Amino acid sequence: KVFERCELARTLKRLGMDGYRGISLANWMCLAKWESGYNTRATNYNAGDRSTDYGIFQINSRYWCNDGKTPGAVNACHLSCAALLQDNIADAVACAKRVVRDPQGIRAWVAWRNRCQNRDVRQYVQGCGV
Questions:
Q1: SS3 120
Q2: Residue 120 a catalytic site member
Q3: Would you say domain 1-130 falls under CATH 3.30.420.10?
Q4: Which residue of the set 18, 35, 67, 91 is catalytic?
Q5: Which of 53, 67, 91, 120 is catalytic?
Q6: What does DSSP assign to residue 115?
Q7: How far apart are CA 61 and CA 68, in angstroms?
Q8: Residue 98 has what DSSP assignment?
Q9: Rounded (5°) CA angle 21-8-121
Q10: Contact in structure between 94 and 77 (CB atoms under 8 Å)
Q11: Can you tell me the distance from the alpha carbon of 56 to that of 48, in angstroms, rounded to the nearest whole number?
């Protein structure tokens, strides 16, 4: 599913993402935007380490979810990477919260640092009433 801006915003907010660990809703929105364009079926394979990024937040199979074909894989989120390509993003949000619980925070995602960190990200939530 490809969420519309404000539709994604109201959802992430009801799932307790606004301010989760000091991270604003606008920031989560910015990450999802550049990471997948709000598309839950996004995927990206990394030939270097044989891993794949899944979903709207592009959660990597090497450390977070199990896709069954990644070497030295950990399943820190304890779920199938397939659960991360579903229309209902409850599991993706839950695993996203787990990722940011590590010392690095949202900085774990290179795309967030390059396109969201230290920049005005207000446009992402203006007009949604969140």
A1: coil
A2: no
A3: no
A4: 35
A5: 53
A6: H
A7: 9
A8: H
A9: 60
A10: yes
A11: 22
CB 122: neighbour CB atoms within 10 A?
10
The three-state (H, E, C) secondary structure of 40-97, written as one string: CCCEEEECCCCEEEECCCCEECCCCCECCCCCCCCCCCCCEHHHHHCCCCHHHHHHHH
> DSSP letter at 35?
H
Dist CA 100 CA 89 (whole Å)? 17
Resolution of the experimentally solved model in angstroms = 2.2
Give the domain ranges of the chain.
1-130
What CA–CA distance (Å, rounded) separates 1 from 10? Answer: 16
Q: Phi, psi (5° rounding) for residue 112? A: -65, -45
Q: Alpha-carbon distance 42 to 31, whole Å?
A: 13
Elucidation technique: X-ray
Please choose, from the candidates 74, 101, 76, 96, the residue with its C-alpha nearest in 3D space to the C-alpha of residue 84: 96
3-state SS, residue 8: helix
